[PDB]
A = this chain, B = another copy of it.
Amino acid sequence: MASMERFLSVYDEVQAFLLDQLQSKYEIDPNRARYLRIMMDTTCLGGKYFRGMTVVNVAEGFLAVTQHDEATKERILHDACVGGWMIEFLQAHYLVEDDIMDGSVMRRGKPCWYRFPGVTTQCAINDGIILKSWTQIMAWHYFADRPFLKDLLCLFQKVDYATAVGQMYDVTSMCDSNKLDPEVAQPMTTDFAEFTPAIYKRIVKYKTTFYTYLLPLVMGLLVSEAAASVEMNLVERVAHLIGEYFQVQDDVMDCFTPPEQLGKVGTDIEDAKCSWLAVTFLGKANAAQVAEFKANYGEKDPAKVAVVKRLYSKANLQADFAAYEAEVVREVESLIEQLKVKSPTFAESVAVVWEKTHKR
Residues of A within 8 A of B (CB): 22, 26-29, 31-32, 34-36, 38-39, 42, 97, 100-103, 116-119, 121-123, 125-127, 129-130, 133-134, 136-137, 140, 150, 153-154, 157, 160-162, 164-165, 167-169, 171-172, 177-178, 180-186, 202, 205-206
Contacts and interface: CB of A to CB of B under 8 A. Distances in A.
Nearest to A153: B153
A94 to B, nearest CB: 9
A178 B102 CA distance: 32
Nearest to A30: B177
A15 B69 CA distance: 49
B164 A117 contact: no
B26 A133 contact: no
A343 B126 CA distance: 38
Contacts of A205: 27
Contacts of A183: 116-118
A22 B165 CA distance: 9
B117 A32 contact: no
Contacts of A35: 172, 180-182
A180 B34 contact: yes
B26 A165 contact: yes
A32 B177 contact: yes
Nearest to A206: B26
Contacts of A42: 182
A101 B27 CA distance: 23
A143 B219 CA distance: 23
- Which of A31, A97, A206 counts the most chain B CB atoms within 10 A? A31
Contacts of A137: 157, 161
A126 B101 contact: yes
Contact of A182 (B103, B119, B136): B119
Contact of A136 (B126, B157, B206): B157
Given A100-B125, A181-B35, A162 B118 contact: no
12 contacts: A100-B121, A102-B122, A116-B183, A118-B186, A125-B125, A126-B164, A126-B167, A129-B164, A130-B164, A133-B164, A136-B160, A137-B161
